[PDB]
Design a protein around this ligand. Structure first.
Ligand SMILES: Nc1nc2c(ncn2[C@H]2C[C@H](O)[C@@H](COP(=O)(O)NP(=O)(O)OP(=O)(O)O)O2)c(=O)[nH]1
Ligand SMILES: [Mg+2]
Ligand SMILES: [Mg+2]
Length: 430
DNA sequence: ATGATGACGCT
DNA sequence: AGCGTCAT
């Protein structure tokens, strides 16, 4: 009772851009705005692979990983923007630049953890404390939370979405105990006020809309964010967790979407996150290991301790290209030319990184995939990254992988390569 | 024939 | 050091 931690010590938010690459293209080309629209990579094979989809197009069944030709069958008037192609590969520079726009704005409110090209966590615990003491003790008006959902409300004793949102928010605010600065529900609420302000600033200064989750930890914040996309934010209180998790498939929890989540389901014979509470910590540790067991024991109770890391920049800079089926690289000269293309993009991004961020990469990781191998990587080799020079980087990459070539002859490569991947790592201050 | 490519755990 | 997992 008095000694059992409830995991309510922090206020954490996750902000994620709505259909991000689509919004980047819609900002640039007004003709695409408020329309079913998707962003695709390449064009020749089946119209291009879709990697982002406007909410208007999602209503037709268009999804990520769909070929554009197939999406067009679902949505004949679907509009398409293609990712820039440079040196024969996809070039995502425009979206990396848009990302920096958003991250730099979020950084004004608190130190962020950049978690992807379009989302960041923020620890608002301190900001919340300062806002609480400076609002004197005033109650929090619903007007300060104009796009906020309270997960689980309304409950108990309007048939349209906005009406439901407000009734839930009203129930929540009417119940708040604003006289107690230590109340976690209050801290979350103030967090939500701050996130409304953050999201307003993002939209005002970039034109991009986003959604957000506010909770006590990263996993719940991320989950909350998704509950009411697009252009809304969701507060998941500690109190909301039992009902929320009681019907929540285990795979919806980040890190559980793969084989670990599958084994939890199979070994324990359960479906929902809440069902995990039945097991002792030792029981979970026995099935899934010490780290996973402890994590699962706490997580099914809404508790997680992973900190928001002070990290606004990516830890690695990399680029890759697949060469599927018949396009697999089967000659020495081919392998070298594409290593050079990848290396040239990497040099330009590295040089820009050094100027912007006062750091230099010191290690180069070369990854390949061979024909027949379904793994992401068949083989990885590293070498020193001592100069931002594409010819040197590509030559060095060839050197460390050249012995994979089981060909007898000079100019051929066997088995043919279905992927090349250069990744610059181990940054140092410069 | 998804693709591009990013974080991070394990040994 | 190099491989596996999860992600989208
Ligand atoms: N090259 C590449 N880019 C991708 C891929 N998957 C996603 N992206 C790019 C494209 C995405 O726009 C962007 C952000 O990914 P999300 O936040 O997971 N999806 P979004 O923001 O589109 O929609 P919403 O968040 O509203 O559900 O990352 C991929 O497989 N490959
Ligand atoms: Mg997004
Ligand atoms: Mg995202």
């Amino acid at each position: 009772g008095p000694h059992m931690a409830t995991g309510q010590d922090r206020v954490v938010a996750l902000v994620d851009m709505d259909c991000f690459f689509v919004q980047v293209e819609q900002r640039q080309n007004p003709h695409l705005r408020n329309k079913p629209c998707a962003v695709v990579q390449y064009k020749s094979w089946k119209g291009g692979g879709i990697i982002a989809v406007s909410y208007e197009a999602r209503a037709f069944g268009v999804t990520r990983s769909m070929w554009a030709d197939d999406a067009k069958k679902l949505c004949p008037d679907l509009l398409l923007a293609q990712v820039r192609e440079s040196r024969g590969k996809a070039n995502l520079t425009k979206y990396r630049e848009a990302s920096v726009e958003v991250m730099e704005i979020m950084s004004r409110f608190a130190v962020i953890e950049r978690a992807s090209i379009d989302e960041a966590y923020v620890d608002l615990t301190s900001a919340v404390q300062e806002r609480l003491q400076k609002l004197q003790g005033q109650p929090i008006s619903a007007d300060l939370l104009p796009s906020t959902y309270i997960e689980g409300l309304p409950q108990g004793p309007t048939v349209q979405k906005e009406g439901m949102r407000k009734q839930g928010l009203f129930q929540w605010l009417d119940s708040l105990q604003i006289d107690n600065l230590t109340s976690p529900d209050l801290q979350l609420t103030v967090g939500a006020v701050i996130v409304e302000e953050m999201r307003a600033a993002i939209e005002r200064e970039t034109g991009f809309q986003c959604s957000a989750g506010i909770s006590h930890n990263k996993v719940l914040a991320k989950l909350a964010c998704g509950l009411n996309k697009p252009n809304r934010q969701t507060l998941v209180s500690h109190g909301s967790v039992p009902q929320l998790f009681s019907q929540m498939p285990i795979r919806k929890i980040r890190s559980l979407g793969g084989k670990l989540g599958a084994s939890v389901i199979e070994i324990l014979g359960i479906e929902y996150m809440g069902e995990l509470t039945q097991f002792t910590e030792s029981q979970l540790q026995s099935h899934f290991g010490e780290k996973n067991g402890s994590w699962l024991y706490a997580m099914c109770r809404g508790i997680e301790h992973d900190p928001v890391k002070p990290r606004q920049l990516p830890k690695t800079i990399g680029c890759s290209k697949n060469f599927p089926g018949k396009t697999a690289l089967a000659t020495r000269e081919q392998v070298q030319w594409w290593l050079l293309q990848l290396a040239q993009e990497l040099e330009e991004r590295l040089t820009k990184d050094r100027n912007d961020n006062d750091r230099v990469a010191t290690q180069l990781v070369v990854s390949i995939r061979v024909q027949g191998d379904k793994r992401l990587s068949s083989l990885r080799r590293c070498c020193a990254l001592t100069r931002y020079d594409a010819h040197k980087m590509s030559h060095d990459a060839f050197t460390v992988i050249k012995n994979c070539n089981t060909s007898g002859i000079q100019t051929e490569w066997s088995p043919p390569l279905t992927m090349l991947f250069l990744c610059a790592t181990k940054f140092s201050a410069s």
